[PDB]
Each structure stands twice: as structure tokens, then as C-alpha cells.
């Protein structure tokens, strides 16, 4: 009885996706990720976590004129990477980083078709670029930044309220990686969060100041 997918236009060429999962103990967690628009071509920025909801998304933008070109995911966790086997089945391309790729193959997960590593990698030159800042909610985690809007989706790194899932953290390394993300994309205007509200540049300095804190609590 989960909420439907929602589909809503962010910007111009922009569109946040938004699909649900039970949490047991947090309830329902909504999860965002992007479309972009390049052209008449779509590109995922995650998947929901079902192939039944990427299905739906893949039909909402087909029904509407646009080819779906291909799929990123910012790190290897459901939330991600639930859609990855299903666009796989449709011959659409996938993308993850070599360490998300890895991070799958351990897990027995299907892998994204296409890989990459790095710290700057263009999905697609001058429109679509991803950023690995080190790691920080996972060891692979990635962000996606469009300049020709300066919008920033950082996935499950950016936790402005408070890091969240420890499990696959590396909480020494975080403040590092959110100091770089801070310094790289600090004209930012609009930062997608995968799990809350969409906020400005305020939302990378908040992601750092969990981050330290994160880490002096681990200490003490
Ligand atoms: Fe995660
Ligand atoms: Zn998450």
C-alpha cells in the first residue's frame, strides 16, 4: 500500500522523482531522484527502488516524446540501483562507478552496464556531470551536477538534518569528501537531497556540519 510515484518539473529540463519504501522503525521513506532532459533524449539520475515504478517513469517520459538514453545511479544501495536489472532487460544503458559496480557484484546485485571512475566524469559534456568527493554515506558515493542550471543532486551524501543509515559509512572520511563538495559546488542554487526537501548551497554547509559532528561523536 505504498504511495505512487510521483513525477513533478523542478526546472526547465528537470523533473525530481519521487518513489516510497517501508523503513521498519522510520515507516515510509520517500526517495527523489531526477530526469533530464537533454534535447528530445531522457536521462534517469537513480532509479526508483522497484522495476515496476522505473517502468512507470521510463512510460511517463516515452508517452511524452522522449528516448530514454540511459540511467546513473549515485551509489550502490536499493535506492538507487532498484531499476538497474530492469533497464538492463529494455537494452537502456546504466551507469554507476567502477566502486558501485563492485559494490553490486559483491552484494549479487546486477551491475550498471556502463562504468567509470575519477573525480569529474561527463555522462554528458557541458549538460550532465558527475563528481565523486570520497566517501562519505557509502565508500562510492557520487553527486550529479547540471551547470546549465546549477542544480546539484547529491543523493544520499547530503544530510543536512543528520547522516542517517551508518551502515556503509565511512564516518572518518565524510568531513573531508563534504569539504570538497562544499568548495566545488558552492554556487549551486537549487541542492536535491534524496530524502528531503529541496534547499539551496545552505544544504552542503549543513551536510558538513553533521559530518564533523558525526565524527567527534564517534571519537568521544
Ligand atoms: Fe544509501
Ligand atoms: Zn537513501
Do not use: M
Amino acid at each position: 500500500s505504498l504511495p505512487d510515484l510521483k513525477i513533478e518539473k523542478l526546472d526547465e529540463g528537470v523533473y525530481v522523482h519521487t518513489s516510497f519504501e517501508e523503513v521498519n522503525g522510520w515507516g515510509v521513506v520517500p526517495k527523489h531522484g531526477l530526469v533530464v532532459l537533454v534535447n528530445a533524449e531522457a536521462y534517469l539520475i537513480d532509479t526508483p527502488f522497484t522495476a515496476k515504478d522505473t517502468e512507470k517513469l521510463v512510460t511517463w517520459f516515452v508517452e511524452r516524446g522522449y528516448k530514454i538514453k540511459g540511467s546513473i545511479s549515485s551509489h550502490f544501495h536499493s535506492d538507487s540501483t532498484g531499476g538497474i536489472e530492469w533497464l538492463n532487460s529494455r537494452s537502456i544503458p546504466t551507469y554507476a562507478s567502477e566502486l558501485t559496480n563492485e559494490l553490486l557484484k559483491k552484494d549479487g546485485k546486477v551491475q550498471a552496464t556502463n562504468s567509470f571512475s575519477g573525480v569529474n566524469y561527463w555522462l554528458v559534456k557541458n549538460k550532465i556531470e558527475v563528481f565523486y568527493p570520497g566517501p562519505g554515506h557509502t565508500p562510492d558515493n557520487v553527486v550529479v551536477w547540471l551547470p546549465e542550471r546549477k542544480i546539484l543532486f547529491g543523493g544520499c551524501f547530503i544530510k543536512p538534518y543528520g547522516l542517517g543509515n551508518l551502515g556503509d559509512a565511512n564516518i572518518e572520511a565524510w568531513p573531508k569528501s563534504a569539504k570538497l563538495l562544499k568548495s566545488k559546488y558552492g554556487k549551486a542554487k537549487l541542492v536535491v537531497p534524496s530524502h528531503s526537501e529541496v534547499g539551496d548551497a545552505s544544504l552542503l554547509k549543513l551536510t558538513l556540519e553533521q559530518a564533523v559532528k558525526g565524527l567527534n561523536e564517534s571519537k568521544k
